[PDB]
Structure formats: structure tokens, C-alpha cells
Amino acid sequence: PNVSRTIARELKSFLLEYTDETGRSVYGARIRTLGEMNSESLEVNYRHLAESKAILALFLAKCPEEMLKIFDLVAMEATELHYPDYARIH
Amino acid sequence: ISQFSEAYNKILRNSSSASSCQLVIFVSCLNIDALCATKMLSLLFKKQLVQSQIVPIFGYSELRRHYSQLDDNINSLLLVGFGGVIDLEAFLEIDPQEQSFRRDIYVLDAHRPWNLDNIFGSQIIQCFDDGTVDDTLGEEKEAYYKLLELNDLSKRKQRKKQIHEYEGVLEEYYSQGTTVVNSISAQIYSLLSAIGETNLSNLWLNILGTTSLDIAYAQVYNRLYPLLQDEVKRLTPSSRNSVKTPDTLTLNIQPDYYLFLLRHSSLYDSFYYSNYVNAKLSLWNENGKKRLHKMFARMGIPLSTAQETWLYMDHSIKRELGIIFDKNLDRYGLQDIIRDGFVRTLGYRGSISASEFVEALTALLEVGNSAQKLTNLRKRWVSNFWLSWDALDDRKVELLNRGIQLAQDLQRAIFNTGVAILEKKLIKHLRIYRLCVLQDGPDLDLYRNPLTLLRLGNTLIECCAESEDKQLLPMVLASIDENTDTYLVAGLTPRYPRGTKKPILNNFSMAFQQITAETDAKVRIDNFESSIIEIRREDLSPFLEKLTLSGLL
Structure with a gap:
């Protein structure tokens, strides 16, 4: 659904400026890691996603299928703003 | 002290005869500049x-x-590159034979200051001092016309006070660092243009000559670009290509890189081994190695595409090679990489960067080849010289590549071992100056050659100082394998990070001669350069202590 697009607008906020252990965004450092390693697997902890909101965690136990497709395109957006490239990588 | 063309006509009149001729031009010694010079000389x-x-x-x-x-x-x-420091009139002697002396020894040197006995008192020279330091140079001028030939008690006391008055300022001169003003090649070309030869490969020999030393400073070279680029403008193979064409087909300006072996090696290995970039990015460190990959993540260049040889990389990356670097390198402080360089294209073989060619020749000089052993080794280097001389020729390219497959390997050695040092933090900051010694290492056979330690010493003095506050301090190195503790120790000069105010004039030349004149403990100036000497492990330690004090700088 188109409403789900708005969900992206939220999860991107979870993707970069989310912090833990006194500053130092973890997912920013994962995107930086690959990133340099360019191993094309971005890694998101379920603990944190569930910590921010249980509504998305509930979406993971209901309908992961199309939501991962919604999600990873946004991850590609975050990598795009952090490394203005990888149009040529994967 | 003469017109180049007129010194030329002199060496013409004493030359051609029956039997011919006879002249021995001495190519010396291990400096690529020598080749560059004497090859265009020999062709002439x-x-x-x-x-x-x-x-x-x-x-x-x-x-x-x-x-x-x-x-x-x-x-x-x-003669070439010798005599600027130590005079051969006393060293050879001479013994004047027959004014209008029968033999004229031309001495070509880039080294300063000239020996005092050389320029004035014409016997064997016919000096090449022209035109770099003319100058004056009034300090050498008053050194003789005063000294020679030099109520009466006050006039004797006055006279002697004057003598020491000149001797002090004279002592300031000739005790000094040895620093190349301009590449001897350049001047041979200045001599060559007056005769009227514009030849292309000749000019390439000049480019080779100038770019022989950019590994070490310029220093004037930063302003030598007019004197080359104008000449590149004084000729041209064709107004427009006309691809290729298979002949002429010559050298041209391209955005070249201090980056190492860009064209004949894989890109990633070309950053990872490059000398300027070793430093700024802390590549010996595993934590910094990653920062390179971040560079590639910034460029959008695949890691797999970085691993592949440069001939075969995609075309898009080639066309973007001059852009992407502008877009990215600026952010890493690596903004000084892009030179305006010279590249000669042989067409269907490939192209070659002016600098990389020099890396090939240097590569040739050490590899690809009790007094009996050192003589035999120095002999092996003498033979090897010609293996390197041949690569300059255009008609044989087949062995030039044998240089490059070496030039890569050497770095793979040098870098490796270089890192083997920084892991143990072997640098001794001392007080007055920085100093190091390699007590152990792999494959010291490569390190036998003076020039190998010139390049390792170079990547190391380049690595330790970015800068890297504070106080660029000259470095010392030592290595031993065989020949019973020869422990070769070469002098070095500090590297400014592209912002160079002073030449700084390497002082090891003087500091070593002070020790040869003190206890002279197994000290051997046998190597042609004043910066590099030999020592024994028995006497190296007291030598190091006598090196530490008294410090001349």
C-alpha cells in the first residue's frame, strides 16, 4: 500500500541518527563498514528496532515479505547519502 | 666558467684524430641523472x-x-657527477704537463658547493660550474686573490689578522651540505640547443633527467616546468590525431600522479605501495588500511576492479580518472597528487609515465643483474649498470618490462620490511636528530645497493613525517648481511609536505668527515656520495656516540 511508503519516512530516521551507548550511531558505523568492505549486507539488530517501536517489530512477525523490499531500498538511500555512489556497486 | 658551445668546440678540436680519438667520458655513478645526461651526450x-x-x-x-x-x-x-665536492687535482696529481695544457678534463656536476681548488687555478678544468652557481659566490672569489700570494710588525699583524679574517668566512664555505642545484642533464640540453638539435628522444632524456630526482625534492624543479613545457611546445608530432598514428606517436602532457606505477600495476596496489600516500593515510597501520577502502567506497570503484591490472579496467573509469580524484582526494588531504606530468606513448605497446620509467631503471640497478668480495659485488653492479643502460633504448622494450616486474617486487619487499620497522617503533628520537638502525630483516641482499636504501630511507623519512609536528629531523639507516659486518649507513634529508621554504642542506657529509678526522673508526667514504659511508659493528656504536655529539646542527 502507499501508506507503507510513509513508514519508510520513519524507518530512515531509525537508520542513521539513532544512537546507543552514549552517542556514536551504530547503524551509521555499519553503513560505513559496508561501506569499505562493500560486502552488500547491511545488518539491523531486531533488539533496537523493537526498542524504538513495537509496531514495526509487529510488522516483522506479520508480513516481512514486502516490508524488507520497502526497507532495503531505503537502506540503499542511506548508503547513497553517506557514500554518493554504489550505483556501480550491487 | 665558460660558454657551453665554446667548451664544446674545445672538446671538438682536441678530439678527432688518427688514431681516434681519444676520450673517456666517465658516467658516474649510480644516479639516473648520469644515464640521462651521458646517453644524450653519447648520441651527440x-x-x-x-x-x-x-x-x-x-x-x-x-x-x-x-x-x-x-x-x-x-x-x-x-667526467660526470664527480669532483664538485672533492678536488681531483690533489686526488690525481697532476703534476702539470706541458700553458695550453694537453689534457682537458671536463667535470660535470650538480653538487654544491664546488671544491675551492677546482674553479680557480685552471689545470684540469674547464669547470662546468656554469651557469647555476656563477654566482657570485664572491666568497670563493675573495678566497684566492686575497690568499694568493699574501712599523713592519703592525703591518705583519694587520696582514695576518686579515688572513684569518678571510679564512673564517672561507671556512664557512666548502663546509656545508651537498645539494643539487640543477640536473646536469638540463644543462647538457642547454649545451645541446645552442648546437641546434631538437631531437624528441633527446628531450625525453631531459624529461627523464629532471624527473630522476623528484623522489627527492625538486628543488628548483618546481620552476623547471617552464624550461621543459616550452620545449614540449617547440615541437609536436601532429596538430591533431590521426589515431594513433603508429609513428610519432610521441610524448605529451597528462594529469600524472606521484601515485606509484598506475599504468603498469593494479590500482589498489598502486595506492597501497605509493610513497606519498603511505604517509598521509597511515597504511602500515591496519586501522588506516581501511581508510583506503573508504577512498574506494567514495570513488565507487569496486574493490575487485581495483585489484585488476590497469590496462584492463573499464573505459568509464578511465574517462573519470581525472574527475573522481578531484571529487574525492581533496577530502583526505591527498589533494597534492595531481602534477602536470609528461607521458611518452609508444602506441600499440602502451604508454609510460615519465616517473614510472625512472622506477623501471632504478629497479634495474639493484636486481635482474675480504676486499675481493666487495670488489666482486661492486663489479656485479657495474655489469648491471649496462642492463639498465639498455632499457633506455627505444628499440628494445622487451627487457624494460623486466625492470617493471622488478620495480613492483622491490616495493613489495620495501613496503613489507618498512612496516616490519614501524610495528616495533624502532625510531630513536634522541635529542638533536632522529636516528634508526635495522639490526635484523628479510632479504638484505636487496638493501646492499646505496639506492635501495635511498628509496627505503625515502619512504621512511616520508612516512614518519606527514608532517606530523614537529621538527623535520634527518634519518639514519643501517643494514648487514655478508662481507663481514660492512653495515652500510646512508645519510638522509628531511621531507617537507609540499610547503618547501628552504633547501636545508644535508649535514651528514660534514659530520662524517669530522669523525674520519677524529678516531676514524672503520669509517669508509668509499661510496661516491658524501652522505653514505660504511662501518663495522665493532666500531659502529662508538661511531654512533660520536655522531650524537658534537652535533653540527
Whole structure:
């Protein structure tokens, strides 16, 4: 659904400026890691996603299928703003 | 102290005869500049078909074995890179024979200051001092016309006070660092343009000459670009390509890189081994190695595409090679990489960067080849010299590549071992200056050659100082394998990070001669350069202590 697009607008906020252990965004450092390693697997902890909101965690136990497709395109957006490239990588 | 063209006509009149000729031009020694010079020189001789001998001298002590042994009919002699420091009039002696002296030894040198006994008191020279330091140079000028030939008690006291008055300022001179003003090649070309030869490969020899030393400073070279680029403008193979065409097909300006072996090696290995970039990015560190990959993540260049040889990389990356670097490198502080360089294209073979060619020749000089052993080794270097001489020729490219497959390997050695040092933090900051010694390492065979330690010493003095506050401090290195504790120790000069205010004038030349004149403990100036000497492990430690004090800087 188109409403789900708005969900992206939220999860991107979870993707970069989310912090833990006194500053130092973890997912920013994962995107930086690959990133340099360019191993094309971005890694998101379920603990944190569930910590921010249980509504998305509930979406993971209901309908992961199309939501991962919604999600990873946004991850590609975050990598795009952090490394203005990888149009040529994967 | 003469017109180049007129010194030329002199060496013409004493030359051609029956039997021809005779002259021995001494190519010396291990400095690529020498080749660059003497090759265009030798080609110039072949033009008028003047017979010549050409000798590969290594040791400065070795020259005595030659000049004292074989000379018969030779009325006109030529020498290269020697004598600017130590005078050969006393060293060879001479013993004036027959004014209008029969033999004229031309001495070509880039080194300063000239020996005092050389320029004034004309016997063997016919000096090449022109035109770099003319100057004045009034300090050497008052050194003689005053000194020579030099109520009466006050006039004697006055006279002697004047004598020491000149001797002090004179002592300031000739005790000083040895620093190249301009590349001897450049001047041979200045001599060459007056005769009227514009030849392309000649000019390439000049480019080679100038770019021989950019590994070490410029220093004037930063302003040598006019004197080359204008000449590149004084000729042109075709107004427009006309691809390729298979002939002429010549050198051209391209955005070249201090980056190492870009065209003949894989890109990633080309950053990872490059000398300027070793430093700024902390590549010996595993934590910094990643920062390179971040560079590639910034460029959008695949890691797999970085691993692949440069001939075969995609075309898009080639067309973007001059852009992407502008977009990215600026952010890493690596903004000084892009030079305006010279590249000669042989067409269907490939192209070659002016600098990389020099990396090939240097590569040739050490590899790809009790007194009996050192003589035999220096001999092996003498033979190897010609293996390197041949690569300059255009018609044989097949062995030039044998240089490059070496030039890569050497770095793979040098870098490796270089890192082997920084892991143990072997640098001794001391007080007055920085110092190091390699007590152990892999494959010291490569490190036998003076120039190998010139390049390792170079990547290391480049690595330790970015800068990297504070106080660029000259570095010392040592290595030993065989020949019973020869422990070769070369002097070095500090590297400014592209912002160079002063030449800084390497002082090890003086500091070593002070020790040879003190206890002289197994100290050997046998190598041609004043910065590099030999030592024994027995006497190296007291030598190091006598090196520490008294510090001349």
C-alpha cells in the first residue's frame, strides 16, 4: 500500500541518527563498514528496532515479505547519502 | 666558467684524430641523472661519429684505480657527477704537463658547493660550474686573490689578522651540505640547443633527467616546468590525431600522479605501495588500511576492479580518472597528487609515465643483474649498470618490462620490511636528530645497493613525517648481511609536505668527515656520495656516540 511508503519516512530516521551507548550511531558505523568492505549486507539488530517501536517489530512477525523490499531500498538511500555512489556497486 | 658551445668546440678540436680519438667520458655513478645526461651526450658524439670510451664507475676510490692505470693517448677527458665536492687535482696529481695544457678534463656536476681548488687555478678544468652557481659566490672569489700570494710588525699583524679574517668566512664555505642545484642533464640540453638539435628522444632524456630526482625534492624543479613545457611546445608530432598514428606517436602532457606505477600495476596496489600516500593515510597501520577502502567506497570503484591490472579496467573509469580524484582526494588531504606530468606513448605497446620509467631503471640497478668480495659485488653492479643502460633504448622494450616486474617486487619487499620497522617503533628520537638502525630483516641482499636504501630511507623519512609536528629531523639507516659486518649507513634529508621554504642542506657529509678526522673508526667514504659511508659493528656504536655529539646542527 502507499501508506507503507510513509513508514519508510520513519524507518530512515531509525537508520542513521539513532544512537546507543552514549552517542556514536551504530547503524551509521555499519553503513560505513559496508561501506569499505562493500560486502552488500547491511545488518539491523531486531533488539533496537523493537526498542524504538513495537509496531514495526509487529510488522516483522506479520508480513516481512514486502516490508524488507520497502526497507532495503531505503537502506540503499542511506548508503547513497553517506557514500554518493554504489550505483556501480550491487 | 665558460660558454657551453665554446667548451664544446674545445672538446671538438682536441678530439678527432688518427688514431681516434681519444676520450673517456666517465658516467658516474649510480644516479639516473648520469644515464640521462651521458646517453644524450653519447648520441651527440655518435652524430659526429667521434670515438669514445665510456666507463661505469661505482666507487670514488675506484676512480683512482682507473685514471692511474690506463691513460695513453687521451688528450681530452670528460667526467660526470664527480669532483664538485672533492678536488681531483690533489686526488690525481697532476703534476702539470706541458700553458695550453694537453689534457682537458671536463667535470660535470650538480653538487654544491664546488671544491675551492677546482674553479680557480685552471689545470684540469674547464669547470662546468656554469651557469647555476656563477654566482657570485664572491666568497670563493675573495678566497684566492686575497690568499694568493699574501712599523713592519703592525703591518705583519694587520696582514695576518686579515688572513684569518678571510679564512673564517672561507671556512664557512666548502663546509656545508651537498645539494643539487640543477640536473646536469638540463644543462647538457642547454649545451645541446645552442648546437641546434631538437631531437624528441633527446628531450625525453631531459624529461627523464629532471624527473630522476623528484623522489627527492625538486628543488628548483618546481620552476623547471617552464624550461621543459616550452620545449614540449617547440615541437609536436601532429596538430591533431590521426589515431594513433603508429609513428610519432610521441610524448605529451597528462594529469600524472606521484601515485606509484598506475599504468603498469593494479590500482589498489598502486595506492597501497605509493610513497606519498603511505604517509598521509597511515597504511602500515591496519586501522588506516581501511581508510583506503573508504577512498574506494567514495570513488565507487569496486574493490575487485581495483585489484585488476590497469590496462584492463573499464573505459568509464578511465574517462573519470581525472574527475573522481578531484571529487574525492581533496577530502583526505591527498589533494597534492595531481602534477602536470609528461607521458611518452609508444602506441600499440602502451604508454609510460615519465616517473614510472625512472622506477623501471632504478629497479634495474639493484636486481635482474675480504676486499675481493666487495670488489666482486661492486663489479656485479657495474655489469648491471649496462642492463639498465639498455632499457633506455627505444628499440628494445622487451627487457624494460623486466625492470617493471622488478620495480613492483622491490616495493613489495620495501613496503613489507618498512612496516616490519614501524610495528616495533624502532625510531630513536634522541635529542638533536632522529636516528634508526635495522639490526635484523628479510632479504638484505636487496638493501646492499646505496639506492635501495635511498628509496627505503625515502619512504621512511616520508612516512614518519606527514608532517606530523614537529621538527623535520634527518634519518639514519643501517643494514648487514655478508662481507663481514660492512653495515652500510646512508645519510638522509628531511621531507617537507609540499610547503618547501628552504633547501636545508644535508649535514651528514660534514659530520662524517669530522669523525674520519677524529678516531676514524672503520669509517669508509668509499661510496661516491658524501652522505653514505660504511662501518663495522665493532666500531659502529662508538661511531654512533660520536655522531650524537658534537652535533653540527
